Amino acid sequence: MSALTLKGTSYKMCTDKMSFVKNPTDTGHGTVVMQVKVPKGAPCKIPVIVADDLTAAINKGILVTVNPIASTNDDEVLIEVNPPFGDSYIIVGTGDSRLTYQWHKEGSSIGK
């Protein structure tokens, strides 16, 4: 939700081929912890989104740590995210270059 900084407000997009160096994992502390990479051509404030739609038409979840910036185009980094209760797809990137990872939090379609 745009009630906090990094959600649809403004960023210099990454559009070169991103990846997870570590998939998101539910900490039980209210957070989902991942590692991500950018490879070349990309000065960017790395677009971290959370959706129900695989494309970030919805803009559900919050950045728990700082939203980082690729100042070397190969930059890779620790990020934590926070969905609300229930379903999500964590999304890393913009362009065809973006990836996603499915996560459900307790209380909608499953109990954990």
From Swiss-Prot:
It is found in: Virion membrane; Host endoplasmic reticulum membrane. N-glycosylated. Disulfide bonds join C14-C44. It comes from the Viruses. It is a multi-pass membrane protein. Homodimer; in the endoplasmic reticulum and Golgi. Interacts with protein prM. Interacts with non-structural protein 1. Binds to host cell surface receptor and mediates fusion between viral and cellular membranes. Envelope protein is synthesized in the endoplasmic reticulum in the form of heterodimer with protein prM. They play a role in virion budding in the ER, and the newly formed immature particle is covered with 60 spikes composed of heterodimer between precursor prM and envelope protein E. The virion is transported to the Golgi apparatus where the low pH causes dissociation of PrM-E heterodimers and formation of E homodimers. prM-E cleavage is inefficient, and many virions are only partially matured. This is Envelope protein E. It comes from Yellow fever virus (isolate Ivory Coast/1999) (YFV).
